[PDB]
Amino acid sequence: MRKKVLLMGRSGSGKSSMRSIVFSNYVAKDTRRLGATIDIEHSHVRFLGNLVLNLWDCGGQEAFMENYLSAQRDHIFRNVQVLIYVFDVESREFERDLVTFRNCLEATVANSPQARVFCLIHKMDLVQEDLRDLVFEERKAILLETSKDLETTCLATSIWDETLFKAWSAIVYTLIPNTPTLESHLREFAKAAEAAEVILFERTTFLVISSYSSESNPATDAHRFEKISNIVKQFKLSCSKMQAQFTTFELRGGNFSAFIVPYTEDTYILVVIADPEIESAVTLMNIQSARRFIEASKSAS
Amino acid sequence: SPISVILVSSGSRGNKLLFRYPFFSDVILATILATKSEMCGQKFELKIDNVRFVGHPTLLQPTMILFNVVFALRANADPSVINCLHNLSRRIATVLQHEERRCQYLTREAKLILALHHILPKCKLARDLKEAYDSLCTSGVVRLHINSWLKAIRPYHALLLLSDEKSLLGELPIDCSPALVRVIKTTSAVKNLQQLAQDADLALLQVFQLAAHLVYWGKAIIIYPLCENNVYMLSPNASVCLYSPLAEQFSHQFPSHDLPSVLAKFSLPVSLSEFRNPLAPAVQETQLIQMVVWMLQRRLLIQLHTYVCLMAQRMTENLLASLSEHERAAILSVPAAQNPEDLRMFARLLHYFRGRHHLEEIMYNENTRRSQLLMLFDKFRSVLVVTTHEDPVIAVFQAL
Amino acid sequence: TLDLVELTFKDQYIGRGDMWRLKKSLVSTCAYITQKVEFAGIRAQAGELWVKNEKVMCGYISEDTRVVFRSTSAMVYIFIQMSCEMWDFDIYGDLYFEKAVNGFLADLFTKWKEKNCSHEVTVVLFSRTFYDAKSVDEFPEINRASIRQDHKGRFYEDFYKVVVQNERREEWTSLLVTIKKLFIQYPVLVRLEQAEGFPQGDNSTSAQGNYLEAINLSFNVFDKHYINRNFDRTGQMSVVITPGVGVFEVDRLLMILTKQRMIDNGIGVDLVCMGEQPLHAVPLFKLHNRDDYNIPHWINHSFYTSKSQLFCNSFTPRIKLAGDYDAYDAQVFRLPEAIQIHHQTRQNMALLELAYHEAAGRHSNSPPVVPGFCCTVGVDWKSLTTPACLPLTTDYFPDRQGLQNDYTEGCADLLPEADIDRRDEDGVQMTAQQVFEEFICQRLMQGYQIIVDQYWLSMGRTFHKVTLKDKMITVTRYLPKYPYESAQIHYTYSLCPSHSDSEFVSCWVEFSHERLEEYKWNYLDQYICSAGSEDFSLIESLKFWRTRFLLLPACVTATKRITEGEAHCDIYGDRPRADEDEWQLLDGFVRFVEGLNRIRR
Amino acid sequence: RIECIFFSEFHPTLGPKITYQVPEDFISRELFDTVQVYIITKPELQNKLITVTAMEKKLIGCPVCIEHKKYSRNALLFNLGFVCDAQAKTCALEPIVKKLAGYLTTLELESSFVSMEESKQKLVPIMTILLEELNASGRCTLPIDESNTIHLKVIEQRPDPPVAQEYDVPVFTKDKEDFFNSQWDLTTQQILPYIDGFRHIQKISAEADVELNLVRIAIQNLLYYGVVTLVSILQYSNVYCPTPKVQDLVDDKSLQEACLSYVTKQGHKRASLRDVFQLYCSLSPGTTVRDLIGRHPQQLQHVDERKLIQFGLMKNLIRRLQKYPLYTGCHSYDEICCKTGMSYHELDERLENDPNIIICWK
Numbered sequence A: 001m002r003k004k005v006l007l008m009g010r011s012g013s014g015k016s017s018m019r020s021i022v023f024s025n026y027v028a029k030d031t032r033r034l035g036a037t038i039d040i041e042h043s044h045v046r047f048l049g050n051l052v053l054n055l056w057d058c059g060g061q062e063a064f065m066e067n068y069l070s071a072q073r074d075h076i077f078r079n080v081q082v083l084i085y086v087f088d089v090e091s092r093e094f095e096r097d098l099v100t101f102r103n104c105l106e107a108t109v110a111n112s113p114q115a116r117v118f119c120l121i122h123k124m125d126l127v128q129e130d131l132r133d134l135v136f137e138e139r140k141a142i143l144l145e146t147s148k149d150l151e152t153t154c155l156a157t158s159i160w161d162e163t164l165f166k167a168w169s170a171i172v173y174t175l176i177p178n179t180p181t182l183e184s185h186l187r188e189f190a191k192a193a194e195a196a197e198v199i200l201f202e203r204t205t206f207l208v209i210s211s212y213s214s215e216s217n218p219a220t221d222a223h224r225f226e227k228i229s230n231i232v233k234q235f236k237l238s239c240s241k242m243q244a245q246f247t248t249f250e251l252r253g254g255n256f257s258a259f260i261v262p263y264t265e266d267t268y269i270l271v272v273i274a275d276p277e278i279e280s281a282v283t284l285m286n287i288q289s290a291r292r293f294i295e296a297s298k299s300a301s
Numbered sequence B: 001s002p003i004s005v006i007l008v009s010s011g012s013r014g015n016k017l018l019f020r021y022p023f024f025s026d027v028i029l030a031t032i033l034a035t036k037s038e039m040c041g042q043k044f045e046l047k048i049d050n051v052r053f054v055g056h057p058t059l060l061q062p063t064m065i066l067f068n069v070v071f072a073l074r075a076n077a078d079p080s081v082i083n084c085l086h087n088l089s090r091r092i093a094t095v096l097q098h099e100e101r102r103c104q105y106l107t108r109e110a111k112l113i114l115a116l117h118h119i120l121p122k123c124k125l126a127r128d129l130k131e132a133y134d135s136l137c138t139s140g141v142v143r144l145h146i147n148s149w150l151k152a153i154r155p156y157h158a159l160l161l162l163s164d165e166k167s168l169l170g171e172l173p174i175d176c177s178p179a180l181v182r183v184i185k186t187t188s189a190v191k192n193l194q195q196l197a198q199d200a201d202l203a204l205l206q207v208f209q210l211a212a213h214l215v216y217w218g219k220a221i222i223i224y225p226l227c228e229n230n231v232y233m234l235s236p237n238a239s240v241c242l243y244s245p246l247a248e249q250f251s252h253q254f255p256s257h258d259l260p261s262v263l264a265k266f267s268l269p270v271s272l273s274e275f276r277n278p279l280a281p282a283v284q285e286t287q288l289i290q291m292v293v294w295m296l297q298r299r300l301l302i303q304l305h306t307y308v309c310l311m312a313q314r315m316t317e318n319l320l321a322s323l324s325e326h327e328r329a330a331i332l333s334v335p336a337a338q339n340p341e342d343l344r345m346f347a348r349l350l351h352y353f354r355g356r357h358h359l360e361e362i363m364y365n366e367n368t369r370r371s372q373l374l375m376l377f378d379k380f381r382s383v384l385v386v387t388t389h390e391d392p393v394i395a396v397f398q399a400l
Numbered sequence C: 001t002l003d004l005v006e007l008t009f010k011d012q013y014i015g016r017g018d019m020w021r022l023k024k025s026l027v028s029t030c031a032y033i034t035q036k037v038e039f040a041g042i043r044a045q046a047g048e049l050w051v052k053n054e055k056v057m058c059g060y061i062s063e064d065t066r067v068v069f070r071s072t073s074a075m076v077y078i079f080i081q082m083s084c085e086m087w088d089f090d091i092y093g094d095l096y097f098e099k100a101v102n103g104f105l106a107d108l109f110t111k112w113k114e115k116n117c118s119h120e121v122t123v124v125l126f127s128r129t130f131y132d133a134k135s136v137d138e139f140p141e142i143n144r145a146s147i148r149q150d151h152k153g154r155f156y157e158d159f160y161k162v163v164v165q166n167e168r169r170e171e172w173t174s175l176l177v178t179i180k181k182l183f184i185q186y187p188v189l190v191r192l193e194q195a196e197g198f199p200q201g202d203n204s205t206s207a208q209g210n211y212l213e214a215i216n217l218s219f220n221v222f223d224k225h226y227i228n229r230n231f232d233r234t235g236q237m238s239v240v241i242t243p244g245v246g247v248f249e250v251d252r253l254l255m256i257l258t259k260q261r262m263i264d265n266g267i268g269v270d271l272v273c274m275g276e277q278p279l280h281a282v283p284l285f286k287l288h289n290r291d292d293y294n295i296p297h298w299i300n301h302s303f304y305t306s307k308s309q310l311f312c313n314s315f316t317p318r319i320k321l322a323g324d325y326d327a328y329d330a331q332v333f334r335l336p337e338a339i340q341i342h343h344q345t346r347q348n349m350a351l352l353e354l355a356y357h358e359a360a361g362r363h364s365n366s367p368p369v370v371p372g373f374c375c376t377v378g379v380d381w382k383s384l385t386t387p388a389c390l391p392l393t394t395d396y397f398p399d400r401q402g403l404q405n406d407y408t409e410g411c412a413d414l415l416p417e418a419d420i421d422r423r424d425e426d427g428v429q430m431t432a433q434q435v436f437e438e439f440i441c442q443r444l445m446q447g448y449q450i451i452v453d454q455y456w457l458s459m460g461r462t463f464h465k466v467t468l469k470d471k472m473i474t475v476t477r478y479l480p481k482y483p484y485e486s487a488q489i490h491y492t493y494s495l496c497p498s499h500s501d502s503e504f505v506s507c508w509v510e511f512s513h514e515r516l517e518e519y520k521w522n523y524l525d526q527y528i529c530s531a532g533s534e535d536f537s538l539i540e541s542l543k544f545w546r547t548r549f550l551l552l553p554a555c556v557t558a559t560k561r562i563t564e565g566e567a568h569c570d571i572y573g574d575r576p577r578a579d580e581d582e583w584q585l586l587d588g589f590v591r592f593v594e595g596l597n598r599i600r601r
Numbered sequence D: 001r002i003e004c005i006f007f008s009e010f011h012p013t014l015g016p017k018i019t020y021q022v023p024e025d026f027i028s029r030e031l032f033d034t035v036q037v038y039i040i041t042k043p044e045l046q047n048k049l050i051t052v053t054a055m056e057k058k059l060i061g062c063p064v065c066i067e068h069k070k071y072s073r074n075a076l077l078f079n080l081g082f083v084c085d086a087q088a089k090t091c092a093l094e095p096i097v098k099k100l101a102g103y104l105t106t107l108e109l110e111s112s113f114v115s116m117e118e119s120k121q122k123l124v125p126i127m128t129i130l131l132e133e134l135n136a137s138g139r140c141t142l143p144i145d146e147s148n149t150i151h152l153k154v155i156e157q158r159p160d161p162p163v164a165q166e167y168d169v170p171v172f173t174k175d176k177e178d179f180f181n182s183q184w185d186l187t188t189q190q191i192l193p194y195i196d197g198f199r200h201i202q203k204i205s206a207e208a209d210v211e212l213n214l215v216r217i218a219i220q221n222l223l224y225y226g227v228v229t230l231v232s233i234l235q236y237s238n239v240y241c242p243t244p245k246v247q248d249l250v251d252d253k254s255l256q257e258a259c260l261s262y263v264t265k266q267g268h269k270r271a272s273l274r275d276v277f278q279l280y281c282s283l284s285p286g287t288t289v290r291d292l293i294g295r296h297p298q299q300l301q302h303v304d305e306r307k308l309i310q311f312g313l314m315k316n317l318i319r320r321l322q323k324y325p326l327y328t329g330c331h332s333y334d335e336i337c338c339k340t341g342m343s344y345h346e347l348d349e350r351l352e353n354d355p356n357i358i359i360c361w362k
């Protein structure tokens, strides 16, 4: 199963930085040494087994993207699953960006009429904090006026905080099929194991595939998933400095207990128990019961 | 001799490399060799450091838009190698485009490639590209099992098949033309192309075009027909080694004789009539005829033709005065021009007496006997110069 | 057990006796790769370890492992021959100066940056221009002394343009720009572009050049290595870069003198930075000039090939001008059941006239791969980045008839504990093991090699036998009966220094070979053993290592003013530290001489 | 041959753009948009000598990448190249444009020639001078800076020479006295006075003291430069056959002039074309040189048969018949007589009674 994802945007908007940080295990300080992307850099990402993401890291320069809409129009915009257009919020040519975004939208509608548009308004860390909301809603009122042709969500991203993983989790959540089945599986696992919060990650990129939070969840932060993803990616890089693979995490807090163990061959599961009376050794094989069940299910199938 | 055969596709799924027979990476070569739709139908010549990529991109008319058959060359080669490799690439690309139009062959084989030593029996396209590479890398007879799918040829030449006729009818498809199967089923080593045209009820230009198509793909050759007056000669490119594979094939097909002995019988210029001894039976003679046909298929023999060069009523005088007066006075100094018929016989063949047309062409085009032409050479022995050498026309017809 | 281990020094001067002491300290120890070995201030790193021509990681030293002392801090000397071939092209379209500087010097400097070696580099451009004068009086009076006469009657002048004198610095690739700016103005410098009061002048061929004179100038530099001894450079190498193919037209006496000077110590490395390795014996000396051919095997020749495209590689250059029967047939191949006899003779073959006479002899009975002496030689980058020192051990030793046939034996006895009075804090009076070890160290520091207690020592044609038995030290010297009585060669040249632009100074120097048999070894043995003489450091023929230090006043304020950006440097008033406090500086000098005497207060 | 010299560079916020061209607007925007992949390339193709055939042209180039920290993002990405006609050779301008790319790389690394705007204006006079004196003379000497000067020279790009065997005979075609003999190679100076036109490679190697492999590589190098050419041994028992190029004798006047200046003896009159043509056409298999001499004494009065056979073999007017009997079929009598030591008559005495391998006239 191949999904074709377009990564378009203006010159210097930061598309290769997002591709390197999310998929190629870069950090934010290492993207300053990234060179210019000449034409299109095709990337194949093995994400959740049989599903393969075709990432088309297109060049953002003007002579490249005049060539994209004229000669390579049939090669690029045909069979497009997700179109990602990246907007630099510190760009002084936003009216020049809107016309090019309209041209890319017109080519995408004329070639692949069943596609989803994501407008990532990048470089939000260069905007001061109290102005970081009403500026973004200023652009979000424009692009949603522009993008009435297809389904479009606009997200404010930056590589120096947790919003990048939220945006890329929202991007790859639509590409994963049968997500109500995984949501029902996580709901039944949290009901069976008496867990407050069950979050399923990916093994390599650590993007949040699915999550389920019960009413007994002690966490009140709405941006906790991408924060935990950043935590486990930083610790995976710390383990990879020692040439070792992180396998299991166990915690016993004052009122909680968090367990990060591998679930499938391509996932990690975070299980949080809100009851301190439940020991670690009960939950650490309560997860293994479901792991043995899905191994027995996937052995026959 | 090219380095490699590269098949590069392009479309909405990205630039992909489908095949590369001698096992730059595949992703880098797929990025390099992929062209756009504006570059289709023209010659693609690209040289990176020392390798030269010659190909012909063709629009596929599925996610694929473009495909290209690319031959990699060492860039010290002649431009004739580049021209014939571009011709081979555009012919293979036209064949694959017609296969895509017919039965969706290229898209199905590309899906079989993308689903995946072991690739060669599983893929027919890998087999015919390997056959094209093996036909390019060797000067011998290599069978091109790709597809049939549709200049200086003379009417006195003969079309000789390089393989069995039954195998050629087996390889031809259901939708083949009636003219091609009539040409293959009708022709013979002795029967020339004019009798091939008037016996298979086809026009001569269509027979010439089918013969050119047959000798391009390595299924036939253009030779002079077999006759007892044909003086043969050992070719300089022949191999008389006992460890040669052609000697092994001659021992496998003819176990009664050995190849260096029979090639040593053709050391001196002798005809087929000089082989025929009263002690030798006719079965030995027919076996020798089959062996001559076999090593003419391997280009181990050359035919020596007699070439004549020129030195020092009203239409006869006009043709005699068409040339210079010094050679006219040299002709008048010969007393054998006092005959009335000899002047007309000399003046009728003045365009043929330049050393470019041999005696067989003169006796076929004018429908004259060899004895009359030898008598004409005896009358003008002090003017004409008579030499014997091989025909350079025969070396042009080869599998490119 | 290892059979080869290499130790590299860095930023530190190590004597040969100190290298022998380090080899004795590593005589029964295990060594691993990249191991810091320190012994009495001599720090060294184990570079590579070999067992049976294979690079290994560990090993053991058991008195049969030969050691190699390389240096990453050497007094290297680079000579560049700016002959007439430096303005010529090649088969790849590069100028030979462009090929040499842009390929070999850039590759050498980047490999020096890769190996992190800090050499003391001297770069000098040398050439020779032949004049058309037919007398001496055409040249001006101010520089007539540096103009010589050839053996063919031609008049020439040798030019030596120094661009770096003794500089040590990182990032040597900034040098090349200056070398490039000594390429444009070079024919103006060596009087090719019609200087005033001179003849025409033509730049010579690289074969007809001052190559051996440049080698002997580097040898004259390295002969006085004891005069200004720094404590942070160890090795010596002299590099000659030439745009000729490797052939030279040299003098016989100069070649004999250069070989005899290289027997005493081995420095000379030449490489060819033009390419095109010729199809003969490559280091070639055409004698009687400046035919009779000589092949020097004492030159470590190398060949540089920078970059190319597809073709076969040519080795010869191309030139265009400015502008009756059966007796002939038998002499075609003259001087250049029988079928089975002939075939078995050809099978018994497994070089032209030898095989032909072999066929003519054995027939009466029973009735383009390149050759090994012309193969492609690469650049010895190991000898040019980390130059190895002279080995402490040699295996050559003549027999008893050779030692009694051409050598004169003379013995000298030193009885210990009565003739020795070297006192260390009035303690033990320098026992005979210490004097014996000091004798071997003083022999090794002059350039002797140990022939593989009792030690046999050799340097050139002189042999030493230093024997310690039952408290007696016996030193026997074996001098040859027919010594190499060479002569002196007077040399005149034009020299431009490192900080001068176009002023060529007329200089002269004499090429001479030192006498190793005339060294006063008895005076050095008296200096080592006896403590009462001690004035032998003033004897110049003993070649004491010397260095000089000056104690200067520290005018920190005016120096900081000039280095801060003052335009005028004459801000010192009339005396350095003119008043200050006059007894504060004297008390500082009293404290300094207290530190000289190791007096603590 | 060079029709335009163009200098392109990678802009920030614009793609590959063309900055300077010598004949004003030669390269169109459609033509540059067709080949902008191969002009400003991906990092897998940088510092490579990429030439590509255009719609009607041949875009020669070499993209240069620097990758510092002081640049726009990280690197410069410039490209100076040539464009010629598509039917031209363009095999000699590729080292010229690679040397120009190296010149621009060293000039940028030394004095920042491409980064600074005041040195970008000097590229147009440099490229006008380059297009002026590379097309005309094929040699440019252009001083740029105080230390840098562009030195370029077109090499003739000769093809690869054939491998010279031990039995081959080198024959001069280029008149030795028109060479400065003092500045040849020393091996070539040893080999050249013993070449003549009738001596083997082993006979040169043994008549001199040069080794066989050294004289083989030297003859191959002289074949590379077109100085000598290889013919076979010219024994009087050789059998020659004519080639179809004998009519190319009388279809080309310059070949007739070369025959009448080469074949005729020293001090004699110029021979007739009829005699030389009849001597070429009388060569039949089974007849040696002695049969040609005894058959035609009138035509050999002012004709040397050695020079006749030599110029027939040089211009491929006649071929040879060597007898192929190690007694395998790979070697002829010339190879066996060159290897063992016997002459033709002795080897024919040994190999006449051959009941195992039968003689082949290949």
Ligand SMILES: Nc1nc2c(ncn2[C@@H]2O[C@H](COP(=O)(O)OP(=O)(O)O)[C@@H](O)[C@H]2O)c(=O)[nH]1
Pocket: A009, A010, A011, A012, A013, A014, A015, A016, A017, A018, A031, A032, A033, A034, A035, A036, A037, A059, A060, A122, A123, A124, A125, A126, A157, A158, A159, A160
């Ligand atoms: N402050 C800030 N800088 C960014 C962000 N994203 C990217 N950058 C910087 O902007 C540059 C963008 O370069 P690149 O990703 O190659 O641009 P592209 O060619 O459009 O892919 C990088 O060097 C990053 O250091 C962001 O979210 N915030």
Ligand SMILES: [Mg+2]
Pocket: A015, A016, A017, A036, A037, A057, A058, A059, A060
């Ligand atoms: Mg990018």
